[PDB]
């Protein structure tokens, strides 16, 4: 699974 | 599964 | 699943 | 599934 | 299934 | 199914 | 189904 | 099914 | 808007 | 606006 | 905006 | 906005 | 914003 | 922002 | 931001 | 931010 | 920020 | 599983 907070 | 916050 | 966030 | 917010 | 928020 | 808003 | 919502 | 609200 | 798929 | 599939 | 899909 | 995939 | 895979 | 994946 | 793989 | 693998 | 692999 | 946070 994949979480990106820019 | 992915969540992308920009 | 995927949700993007602008 | 897709959730897109731009 | 799709939904798409501009 | 789909749904758009624009 | 479908439905725009401009 | 279809509806368009424009 | 409604749209409504039973 | 709302959508529903059921 | 609301898209349920059961 | 709100997406529920049951 | 909301997306539930259940 | 929420995704939850069950 | 939340995401939550079960 | 939060990310949980189950 | 929080990342959890039980 | 992969979380960055910018």
């Known amino acids: ?3 990106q907070n820019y």
Do not use: D, I, S
């Open 1 to 3: 699974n994949n979480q």
